[PDB]
């Protein structure tokens, strides 16, 4: 309709944000950026809903403009900056380091982290090519153009970024038996280990995964994301560690907490 | 048997056969031909205003014997010269010619009810005031 | 009665990061001289017509009102 939309009114936002129907008519539209707005969590919803650090939009806005929040080492005063998957947050006060990762329930876990390993990030090779003058380059899923990758790299591999300089520290090839994080479908947010792989040529490859408690499943290939090897993920995992337990034990997990 | 194709791929015949036999309805034929919208005093409405032009003493049908005190109301929205029944005792003294009255259906989607020949409407209001209220003398019909 | 609470460290900063309606609520600030939303809309509309200061036409119309 005559151009790109600027208003993303409520009931059209991604459901995993968990916006309140009565709290308003519209929803914060994630501006352009590293992450597509479907899988992105804007700063306003993060800092007002996932943390309650701010009363409302003006207080979130007041925080960003004093440059007190920075994401990935950059201040990003935008209230609706498209923060998405595996996005690190730094706070000068509170000595607080956040990171945006899915929990088992397909929504962004409020997973805190520590300064030492907060300093780095992880991305997944969306494509590998070579630009002008034949300089090879890969693109991480957050649109981090990484020039001069190691030739061992391939597509759909996962690379770790210093985040102080746009440099690859270490990379992981798409090898079987390597822990993968799912970011799409009913398996969204499920951390698990590759069982094997099936090509199914023509598009939309199929991948087989077995959860830590031996909960098998299968998903696409464009929704997977390697995190490392079984027992050594290259980041800390949220409470529940992507186990997708049944629907019964949360009765146990919830009653035991308060109701004993 | 049963005279209908039970074959697994006979869906096309079943739907075509059912779609032709649905025309034998009365309601479905009316809805699909839009006879309310096309040929009906009310353009698919429930109520319609109009002007009382004269009064009709409508002799009832057998076995009854009575004068039904209907009014020849022409509908403002399409000009149709229809006859409207006037319920309740009196209520033909309450209304006169060149009033404005609100008509309603007569309870039977056409097909005049009771012993009233050819009158498929009943007057509800008059001069913008309910004829029911007038009968109970709660309000007074303005001279306007 | 159940509500919400917020305590600021300093009065000087209290006027800074506080919503302005609580400022006049607690008497810290005065409700500024402002007309109703409709009237302050009208004045910008009539100000939208004149292309700049509009004083030149103001002195212009006086001389054409002379004779």
């Amino acid at each position: 309709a005559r151009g790109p939309k600027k208003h993303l009114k409520r009931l059209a936002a991604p459901h995993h944000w968990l916006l309140d129907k009565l709290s308003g008519c519209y929803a914060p539209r994630p501006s352009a950026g590293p992450h597509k707005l479907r899988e992105s969590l804007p700063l306003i919803v993060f800092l007002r809903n996932r943390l309650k650090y701010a009363l409302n939009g003006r207080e979130v806005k007041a925080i960003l403009m004093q440059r007190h929040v920075k994401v990935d080492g950059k201040v990003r005063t935008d209230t609706t900056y498209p923060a998405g998957f595996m996005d690190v947050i730094t706070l000068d006060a509170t000595n607080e380091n956040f990171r945006l990762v899915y929990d088992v329930k397909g929504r962004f876990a409020v997973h805190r982290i520590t300064d030492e390993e907060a300093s780095y990030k992880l991305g997944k090779v969306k494509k590998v090519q070579l630009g002008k003058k034949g300089v090879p380059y890969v693109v991480t899923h957050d649109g981090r153009t990484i020039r001069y990758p190691d030739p061992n790299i391939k597509v759909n591999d996962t690379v770790k970024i210093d985040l102080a300089s746009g440099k690859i520290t270490d990379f992981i090839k798409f090898d079987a038996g390597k822990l993968v994080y799912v970011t799409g479908g009913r398996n969204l947010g499920r951390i698990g280990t590759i069982v094997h792989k099936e090509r199914h040529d023509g598009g939309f490859d199929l991948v087989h995964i077995k959860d830590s408690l031996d909960n098998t499943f299968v998903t696409r290939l464009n929704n997977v994301f390697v995190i490392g090897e079984q027992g050594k993920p290259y980041i800390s995992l949220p409470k529940g560690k992507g186990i997708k337990l049944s629907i019964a034990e949360e009765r146990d997990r919830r009653r035991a907490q308060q109701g004993l | 048997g049963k005279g209908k194709p039970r074959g697994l791929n006979s869906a096309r015949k079943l739907r075509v056969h059912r779609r032709n036999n649905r025309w034998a309805e009365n309601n479905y034929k009316k809805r699909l031909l839009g006879t309310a919208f096309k040929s009906s005093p009310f353009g698919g409405s429930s109520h319609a205003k109009g002007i009382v032009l004269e009064k009709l003493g409508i002799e009832s049908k057998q076995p009854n014997s009575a004068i039904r005190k209907c009014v020849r109301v022409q509908l403002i929205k399409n000009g149709k010269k229809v006859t409207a029944f006037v319920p309740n005792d009196g209520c033909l003294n309450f209304v006169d010619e060149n009033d404005e009255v609100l008509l309603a259906g007569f309870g039977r989607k056409g097909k005049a009810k009771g012993d009233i020949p050819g009158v498929r409407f009943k007057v509800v209001k008059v001069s913008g005031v309910s004829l029911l209220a007038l009968w109970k003398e709660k309000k007074e019909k303005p001279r306007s | 009665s159940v509500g919400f609470g917020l305590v600021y460290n300093s009065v000087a900063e209290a006027k800074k990061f506080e919503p302005t309606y609580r400022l006049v609520r607690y008497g810290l600030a005065e409700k500024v001289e402002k007309a109703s939303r409709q009237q302050r809309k009208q004045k910008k509309n009539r100000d939208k017509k004149i292309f700049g200061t509009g004083k030149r036409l103001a002195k212009k119309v006086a001389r054409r009102n002379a004779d």
Partner: protein, 185 residues
């Protein structure tokens, strides 16, 4: 515009509106619990239809149904917290045996008279609504509130009430005080 606010009616109506066998039967209940109308005894029966519909299409399922005990025990927990089903007999057959007097008894104004202070349900709920009943420390003012079996230790006169103390009421004020002018010349 506005995101729609969900709303759904909580009562059904009999298909046959005028049945001698039915009308008088629920009239006994409305005359056993003083229902202001029979929209109450529908709203319970419609809820009872909605509750027992799930059992109706889940007794079809086996006893190893995750969904069966997923909500069966929890609903009984509501029923035993409220009391409409006692702490024993924790099988959903009993729920299909439950009659609305359960809910009708577990109405407040039903329980309040059972613990007196009212001498009648005629007084029980006017005391409820004349600001003279406290379920806990709070004045719950609706007869069909479905007590969760916990304010039986908290139910009493409203502490703000004259009957709960600290007030004399309007009439006792208007006559005891007016005696002073009325004491003579």
């Amino acid at each position: 515009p506005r995101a729609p606010r969900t709303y759904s009616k909580t009562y059904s109506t009999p298909k046959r509106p005028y049945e001698s066998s039915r009308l008088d039967a629920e009239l006994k209940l409305a005359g056993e619990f003083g229902l202001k109308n029979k929209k109450e005894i529908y709203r319970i029966s419609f809820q009872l239809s909605k509750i027992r519909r799930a059992a109706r299409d889940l007794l079809t399922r086996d006893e190893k149904d995750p969904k069966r005990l997923f909500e069966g025990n929890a609903l009984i927990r509501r029923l035993v917290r409220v009391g409409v089903l006692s702490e024993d007999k924790k099988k959903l057959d009993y729920v299909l045996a439950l009659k609305v007097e359960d809910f009708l008894e577990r109405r407040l104004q039903t329980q309040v008279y059972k613990l007196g202070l009212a001498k009648s349900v005629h007084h029980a709920r006017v005391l409820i609504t004349q600001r003279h009943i406290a379920v806990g420390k709070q004045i719950v003012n609706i007869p069909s509130f479905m007590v969760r079996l916990d304010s039986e230790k908290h139910i009493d006169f409203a502490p703000t009430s004259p009957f709960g103390g600290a007030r004399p009421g309007r009439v006792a004020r208007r006559n005891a005080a007016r005696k002073a002018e009325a004491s003579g010349e």
